[PDB]
Write a protein that binds this ligand. Structure first.
Ligand SMILES: *[C@@H]1O[C@H](CO)[C@@H](O[C@@H]2O[C@H](CO)[C@@H](O[C@@H]3O[C@H](CO)[C@@H](O)[C@H](O)[C@@H]3O)[C@H](O)[C@H]2NC(C)=O)[C@H](O)[C@H]1NC(C)=O
Ligand SMILES: *[C@@H]1O[C@H](CO)[C@@H](O[C@@H]2O[C@H](CO)[C@@H](O[C@@H]3O[C@H](CO)[C@@H](O)[C@H](O)[C@@H]3O)[C@H](O)[C@H]2NC(C)=O)[C@H](O)[C@H]1NC(C)=O
Ligand SMILES: *[C@@H]1O[C@H](CO)[C@@H](O[C@@H]2O[C@H](CO)[C@@H](O[C@@H]3O[C@H](CO)[C@@H](O)[C@H](O)[C@@H]3O)[C@H](O)[C@H]2NC(C)=O)[C@H](O)[C@H]1NC(C)=O
Ligand SMILES: *[C@@H]1O[C@H](CO)[C@@H](O[C@@H]2O[C@H](CO)[C@@H](O)[C@H](O)[C@H]2NC(C)=O)[C@H](O)[C@H]1NC(C)=O
Ligand SMILES: *[C@@H]1O[C@H](CO)[C@@H](O[C@@H]2O[C@H](CO)[C@@H](O)[C@H](O)[C@H]2NC(C)=O)[C@H](O)[C@H]1NC(C)=O
Ligand SMILES: *[C@@H]1O[C@H](CO)[C@@H](O[C@@H]2O[C@H](CO)[C@@H](O)[C@H](O)[C@H]2NC(C)=O)[C@H](O)[C@H]1NC(C)=O
Ligand SMILES: *[C@@H]1O[C@H](CO)[C@@H](O)[C@H](O)[C@H]1NC(C)=O
Ligand SMILES: *[C@@H]1O[C@H](CO)[C@@H](O)[C@H](O)[C@H]1NC(C)=O
Ligand SMILES: *[C@@H]1O[C@H](CO)[C@@H](O)[C@H](O)[C@H]1NC(C)=O
Ligand SMILES: *[C@@H]1O[C@H](CO)[C@@H](O)[C@H](O)[C@H]1NC(C)=O
Ligand SMILES: *[C@@H]1O[C@H](CO)[C@@H](O)[C@H](O)[C@H]1NC(C)=O
Ligand SMILES: *[C@@H]1O[C@H](CO)[C@@H](O)[C@H](O)[C@H]1NC(C)=O
Ligand SMILES: *[C@@H]1O[C@H](CO)[C@@H](O)[C@H](O)[C@H]1NC(C)=O
Ligand SMILES: *[C@@H]1O[C@H](CO)[C@@H](O)[C@H](O)[C@H]1NC(C)=O
Ligand SMILES: *[C@@H]1O[C@H](CO)[C@@H](O)[C@H](O)[C@H]1NC(C)=O
Ligand SMILES: *[C@@H]1O[C@H](CO)[C@@H](O)[C@H](O)[C@H]1NC(C)=O
Ligand SMILES: *[C@@H]1O[C@H](CO)[C@@H](O)[C@H](O)[C@H]1NC(C)=O
Ligand SMILES: *[C@@H]1O[C@H](CO)[C@@H](O)[C@H](O)[C@H]1NC(C)=O
Lengths: 488, 488, 488
């Protein structure tokens, strides 16, 4: 009877592109590109994110009346703003180096708001009750920022501030303040009793001077004067000193801080849920061990690299043809293996996988698709970055970097899978052919090969025929004597 | 007679490098690297470029007397300056954020100069005729910028400007102005009657203050005082307000604008011609569907990627050896095909390509070289960028990005073509070998193979021999009986 | 007797990874990754480095008292600061654009300190002896910077400086100056006799104004006023002008300069030695012709590209198995070659390499591993770059570029060597097989092949057997008559 050699063919319609041939089907494949994400904003790197809801960083750090919460976590791995974040610097004016504060805050390994200049009698001879405005209203009354105190004359005088703090808390200490630019001299003289108003701030690493710019301006939130917000980072043991003979919005809470390398902001409405995470996108978290993703180019954490492609499928299985031997096609009559034998005997009709060869193959195939993933060298990054009104050369430079790595990675990846699919899908045919040859190493003359990729054995035998194949032991010349007439 | 198998060899001397063997010749090749360009500056993306001729952007936007033209197009896809562009800010002084204006202007989807502060009586009690000087001369008379008005006292007083505009035109509105720094107090008091001179500008997104710096300076164009040029975008519905109690060079034309993503400047003398374009270089336009180019690293549009290489040629044809079968060499006696048969019969001497195999091959070869081009993912960019006197850390950072992508792309590309040439130039030999084997699938025993890669058939036959090969139908055992004595 | 075919196997345990099989041994290999460096800071590009020892650039250019040397070379290819560099701007205050000056200085093709405003009577009516301070002491006395002169009133007046220089030396001329900010009005009035103190500086390409910021500050080096340091390049034929009615620290030495493209700073303690160099790292110099290095990511010169990998070894030799023919294993009984023949004759026992085939192989293998190196396109760069307190968006952008090229290069390199090891280690088996087939082209029927990968020859012969193989001339049918009975 015959002995036939070929491969498991399977009901699925999984398809892989190969550089030689588009749109071909393979019996099993490993998808490397994540098209699906978990739809949530999630706990990352052991800690929850800071979620700011209706209010942005320029309102949270100022403590806008319309935003009130504990720090989402005394340690957090990113900042999230909702897609609506209209609340902010509700009293208008530019937050200076605001895109830099937004970087340093993005991750902190501790944070504690602490009242370094406490509202209780740190400010004798001055107001700290009635510095309030309609621009940031609550209860329909005048109200104000909670983290900063807007000082005003008491009575008919403004004693110059001389406040000092010495950083004894053994930490980086973030400090902030504001400066007020009244719209008119009449407003300046009424609140601050001084046209010569100025501020000075002193530090070791830093020192700067500020002055008012009294001039009428277009209405925003119907406010006509405007407020400049500034910030500073005093190192351990350093000292910070304020002086003012006028305009100030002095700190009342400073903030204790420490910072790791960090990772930036995300802006979206997705809700927050407990599950742990390593990789993040604006749309939703990902849990993965794959090299490439296409769901969004912005990322936090151990990013998989973004690509514009859609079907990065590596083959693992064979060319799927159910359409005799491999030259006609495979067998769906075979299961739980790859390459194998159909054989006949007195009981016969056996379809069985060759486990030693299949196991040898899948050892190397597992290492192959694994080498594509294990050698990726992913490392902690935050891909989206923030640039203001007049940084457009650098903003476009960023964009050139971002699309350069995109263009490289799609061309690398799409040619990569094409070359390794071209390899593997002939790797199978070469392993099958080599297994056929390995049967020729017994059946050198004593069987009729047929162009289907199969044998006719020249004389009758029991299952001891397949015993001779599986253990390669064949004792050829006796069996030619039974074959004799059928060869003749 | 013999049947011989091999391949078309050709009179051309086209060469391809392969990682195993340098400088080898192949019968046909696809050049992927453009060494040639069309030598023109051209219509791009459906719109003509702005060509500024003898005058640079800092003179065009100011409207230098020595530059006069309509906007080259009411919509343009890039700005061109000629390699000589000496005219510009002919009254000296720094154009502030000038490299940012040069970016935002680089492309516009509409632009219209419109006289938002018209020269007719917008300036009562003030001069607007005699603000002219020799530094930007015409007819040998004093002259001045056309788009800006240099105001001066009328009589013996300078009433404070209070000009306002409200953006009702439903567009981004670009506005510009100048500020004058007289060289001495005597010049300041004579023109502006005020030592306390200052300017304020107010907006929602912006506000700033400016003051004179009265001090003598080294002569340039023999002007000793100097002029600072500033600019602003007012958003739809926003308001802009000027105040001045002195030095101003107030706007008279503002400009309506809208901007797409855009693409930057080119600087060269090449003339302008009508034909449409997608890809640009400083030397000359390109029309292409190739992935790599080496003519210039600066680019606009859907750039092909730059490389330092010179001979990115993919093979498509075979190893060209005219120097019997393929082991001796190919046949120049064969045409309009690749792999093929020489056969003999009573009429005989046939050299003919095997069209089904050749067509099967060229199907896959076309898809191969096409996959290298189609998967490139080119996208709209402008590679050259501009950095001033004191931005050199960023200028070098740009240069590190530019040469990084260069170093990657040449090493990728040159190894890429080497690997795929190494593949294809054995791909041919394996296809030819497999075609020989496919003849062995008839001629298993009934022909003498010879070490040239050819057959002697053991008995005489008509063209029905080639009929048996072309249709694989051979009826072997009868034909052994005529072969009998010649095998014996 | 027998003719046996296989390959040299060798005592070494050099190992290569292949995508199909980890940790396999190969007889010989070319390491592409420099694990080792020469431990020195070295002469580069034909010129010495500048080595600044105990003092940093912000003290050298000022000429701190504790820093005294010639320029280490009148031309230098990089600046080196020792890992201790605590001396610097020993009178405190920000060196303005200091990270930019640190770039332009990094390499100079000439530099000469020259006393453009010589201490001899360029400063009538003013002090230049007693402008000294305890903040930069020597001998326990007051002392001061050497390259700058701190002017002070003489008597009870301060005549306005009006110094001028015209760049007649035909070079770029670097100029520097300081500005002093006394801590109190009392200190200002006592030293400079004027409250209105200001400085102006004039140039063609540049002009600016400066003023004092008199306010108390936290002690550093127990100094309470602070000093701002500024700089300028005047172009050939250009003029520079100083004016002051007060605070100045005027130049006394300017510096003649010219600059190439340049390459940045290194900071380390490694000692300086004479040997010439092209490639550099902070730890120690390198001399190399390899593409990849992992010893440090910061570099100068013609950098090899950094990777995080550890064992980029290309194969050159074969699969090493000493464990009959190649199917059992190789021979350590063979030397000075690769593929070869064992043969027998009346004297016999010959093990000899096939020199024409081995030479043919090593021609192509040498070109292979060479093509991986020769095409690298290395070009002169300086990878580490410097960003200050408030440039963290750009500092992180740099970091995204740096780890992008890292991530690309490890993934490219590790998959690159895996693919070419997978290629070569079957390239050998295919060349050996083809050499076996090339013996079949004589021994078509006239020898018994055995599954070890070897021949038994059917009749007795002298060394003329190996003569027939080496020269492919075999006269088959005349010899068959001795083989007759042994084939029967
Ligand atoms: C998500 O992540 C959290 C951490 O943020 C996981 O908490 C895990 O909790 C177990 C105990 O339930 C921790 O193990 C125990 O920790 C204590 C000290 O806390 C130690 O004394 C015990 O011997 C034991 O190790 C575990 O360490 C902690 N995980 C980590 C990463 O620290 C939580 O289980 C995670 N949840 C999910 C659904 O993955
Ligand atoms: C170069 O590009 C221009 C466009 O900038 C090409 O103009 C083409 O002109 C033809 C008419 O000759 C347009 O076809 C007709 O357009 C009208 C609207 O204008 C429409 O109603 C008709 O149905 C028809 O489409 C054609 O659309 C237009 N091209 C484009 C892209 O809009 C010009 O022909 C090009 N020249 C060369 C030499 O390539
Ligand atoms: C390290 O590099 C230095 C250069 O910085 C090498 O100096 C070499 O010295 C030899 C002396 O025989 C020079 O040869 C002669 O130079 C003169 C001009 O100086 C010329 O007129 C002669 O015809 C001859 O070329 C040699 O040119 C010079 N090298 C270079 C690159 O100019 C020094 O030898 C190097 N040392 C080591 C250990 O590599
Ligand atoms: C942020 O607070 C501001 C006021 O501080 C809110 O602004 C007002 O919003 C209402 C609608 O809710 C508008 O009709 C008013 O015109 C807004 N005020 C002004 C002065 O223009 C705003 O709603 C808050 N944002 C969010 C997201 O709750
Ligand atoms: C730009 O205009 C300036 C004057 O506004 C021209 O400068 C003069 O050029 C001539 C040579 O053509 C010189 O001899 C004069 O000395 C220049 N004048 C000054 C005041 O420096 C200049 O030629 C114009 N540029 C172009 C390209 O036409
Ligand atoms: C740089 O010079 C400064 C003084 O100008 C030196 O600083 C002193 O260092 C000693 C220790 O060596 C300290 O005890 C003193 O308190 C420091 N003086 C001041 C004023 O702070 C410094 O040592 C020099 N640096 C080097 C590397 O030699
Ligand atoms: C077809 O394949 C699916 C998916 O593996 C499997 O669940 C199913 O049992 C198969 N059915 C048949 C009829 O082969
Ligand atoms: C690939 O197969 C799908 C499903 O049958 C078919 O729709 C598509 O047209 C095929 N692709 C091409 C390139 O024809
Ligand atoms: C300000 O505070 C310091 C604290 O040391 C004190 O010595 C000084 O007298 C105060 N007043 C002024 C005007 O500096
Ligand atoms: C026969 O084959 C099986 C599976 O390979 C093996 O375990 C067994 O030892 C072999 N027996 C002999 C006698 O070779
Ligand atoms: C040689 O090749 C060229 C270009 O393909 C062709 O035009 C020409 O006719 C050929 N000539 C001969 C003599 O083969
Ligand atoms: C390739 O051949 C051409 C023509 O003879 C010659 O110019 C060139 O130098 C050769 N290149 C190599 C690498 O031998
Ligand atoms: C300036 O213009 C505004 C326009 O609303 C006007 O109300 C105001 O009175 C003008 N004058 C001054 C001095 O502001
Ligand atoms: C012989 O070959 C041609 C071309 O392959 C084919 O059209 C024809 O049908 C074949 N003959 C028969 C009898 O099928
Ligand atoms: C083993 O290899 C080393 C290094 O190639 C060589 O020096 C030595 O002589 C070899 N020894 C033996 C015994 O093969
Ligand atoms: C490689 O071989 C070494 C011994 O030389 C062994 O310790 C190591 O485990 C092997 N590698 C792997 C991946 O098993
Ligand atoms: C300053 O120097 C210039 C040029 O030497 C000279 O003309 C001028 O009179 C000097 N004095 C003043 C006050 O400008
Ligand atoms: C035999 O082989 C050697 C080495 O290849 C060669 O030099 C010699 O010419 C050959 N013999 C003949 C008769 O050609």
């Amino acid at each position: 009877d015959t002995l036939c050699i070929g491969y498991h063919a399977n009901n699925s319609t999984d398809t892989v592109d190969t550089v030689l041939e588009k749109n071909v089907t393979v019996t099993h494949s490993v998808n490397l590109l994540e098209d699906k994400h978990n739809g949530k904003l999630c706990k990352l790197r052991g800690v929850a994110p800071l979620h700011l809801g209706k209010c942005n960083i320029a309102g949270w750090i100022l403590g806008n009346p319309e935003c009130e919460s504990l720090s989402t976590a005394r340690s957090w791995s990113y900042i999230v703003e909702t897609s609506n974040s209209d609340n902010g610097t509700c009293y208008p004016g530019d937050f200076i180096n605001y895109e830099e504060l937004r970087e340093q805050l993005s991750s902190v390994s501790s944070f504690e708001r602490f009242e370094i200049f406490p509202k209780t009698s740190s400010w004798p001879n001055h107001d700290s009750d009635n510095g309030v405005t309609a621009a940031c209203p609550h209860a329909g009354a005048k109200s104000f920022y909670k983290n900063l105190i807007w000082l005003v004359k008491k009575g008919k005088s403004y004693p110059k501030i001389n406040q000092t703090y010495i950083n004894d808390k053994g930490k980086e200490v973030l400090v902030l303040w504001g400066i007020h630019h009244p719209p008119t001299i009449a407003d300046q003289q009424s609140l601050y009793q001084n046209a010569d108003a100025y501020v000075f701030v002193g530090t070791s690493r830093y020192s700067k001077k500020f002055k008012p710019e009294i001039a009428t301006r277009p209405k925003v939130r119907d406010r006509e004067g405007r407020m400049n917000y500034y910030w500073t980072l005093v190192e351990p043991g350093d000292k910070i000193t304020f002086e003012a003979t006028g305009n100030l919005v002095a700190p009342r809470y400073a903030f204790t801080m420490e910072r790791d390398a960090g990772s930036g902001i995300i802006i979206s409405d997705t809700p927050v849920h407990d599950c742990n995470t390593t990789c993040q996108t604006p749309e939703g978290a990902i849990n993965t061990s794959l090299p490439f993703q296409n769901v969004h180019p912005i990322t936090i954490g151990k990013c998989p690299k973004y690509v514009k492609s859609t079907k990065l499928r590596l083959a693992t299985g064979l060319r799927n043809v159910p359409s005799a031997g491999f030259i006609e096609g495979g067998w769906t009559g075979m299961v739980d293996g790859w390459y194998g034998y159909h054989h006949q005997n007195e009981q016969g009709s056996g379809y069985a996988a060759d486990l030693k060869s299949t196991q040898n193959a899948i050892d190397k195939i597992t290492n192959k698709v694994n080498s594509v993933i294990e050698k990726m060298n992913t490392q902690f990054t935050a891909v989206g970055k923030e640039f203001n009104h007049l940084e457009k050369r650098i903003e476009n430079l960023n964009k050139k970097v971002d699309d350069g790595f995109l263009d490289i990675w799609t061309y690398n990846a799409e040619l990569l899978v094409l070359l390794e699919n071209e390899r593997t899908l002939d790797y199978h045919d070469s392993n099958v052919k080599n297994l056929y040859e390995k049967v020729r190493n017994q059946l050198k003359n004593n069987a009729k090969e047929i162009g289907n990729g199969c044998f006719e054995f020249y004389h009758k035998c029991d299952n001891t025929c397949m015993e001779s194949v599986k253990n390669g032991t064949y004792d050829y010349p006796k069996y030619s004597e039974e074959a004799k007439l059928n060869r003749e």
